Design a protein around this ligand. Structure first.
Ligand SMILES: C/C=C/Cn1c(Cc2cc(OC)c(OC)c(OC)c2)nc2c(N)ncnc21
Length: 209
């Protein structure tokens, strides 16, 4: 049972800008997605101090980076707070509308795409390198969902019947044909060292079989 939704026009416009603008410094996507994972881990850690049972779904707080050359995917996995169905359909986008407007204005004033994270819409930097993004996510007291979008103005949400995650989020980047460098161990290591070397959770870079 797959539900299809339209992005708000402002968010669709942002996605088109990210896809269409000439901008060579694409590697910043990884810092943004790792920071999102870190934020999610911070949140479940903080909530667990007043309600320890929130970690019944898993105590380990960490990030995995998983390249797969056969599938042409780079997956960023965290065991953070996860996202609810309400997040995926309504609430993240409602918040994102103002950040998108501010980001657009900053760009017109001379900012560049690498500053996208300051506006709360760094997630969408995924589309610098991915033709499709699939997000599998599980929040306590909600179901496991798959969100997906290839841009073009729409996204889908379905209940996920794949392998149960416990709690957290997998961001699966289906890479563009000319962006397979982000499947290489040396390249990912370089980017993590340059931009994400003080993240306060273990980051395990898997190697390709
Ligand atoms: C400021 C938004 C936080 C939501 N979030 C994102 C980024 C994100 C995911 C989203 O959906 C998967 C978004 O809406 C499409 C979105 O809109 C700005 C942002 N990653 C994660 C993550 N790993 N774990 C828990 N929450 C997350």
């Amino acid at each position: 049972e797959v539900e299809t939704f339209a992005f708000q026009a402002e968010i669709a416009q942002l996605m088109s800008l990210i896809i269409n603008t000439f901008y060579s410094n694409k590697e910043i996507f990884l810092r943004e997605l790792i920071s999102n994972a870190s934020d999610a881990l911070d949140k479940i850690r903080y909530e667990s101090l007043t309600d320890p049972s929130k970690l019944d779904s898993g105590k380990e707080l960490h990030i995995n980076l998983i390249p797969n050359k056969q599938d042409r995917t780079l997956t960023i996995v965290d065991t953070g707070i996860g996202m609810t169905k309400a997040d995926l359909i309504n609430n993240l986008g409602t918040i994102a509308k103002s950040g998108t407007k501010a980001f657009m204005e900053a760009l017109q004033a001379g900012a560049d795409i690498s500053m996208i994270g300051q506006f709360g819409v760094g997630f969408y930097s995924a589309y610098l390198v991915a033709e499709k993004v699939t997000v599998i996510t599980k929040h306590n007291d909600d179901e496991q969902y798959a969100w997906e979008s290839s841009a073009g103005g729409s996204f889908t949400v379905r209940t996920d019947t794949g392998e149960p995650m416990g709690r957290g989020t997998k961001v699966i980047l289906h890479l563009k044909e000319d962006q397979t460098e982000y499947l290489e161990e040396r390249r990912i290591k370089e980017i993590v060292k340059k931009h994400s070397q003080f993240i306060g959770y273990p980051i395990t870079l898997f190697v390709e079989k």
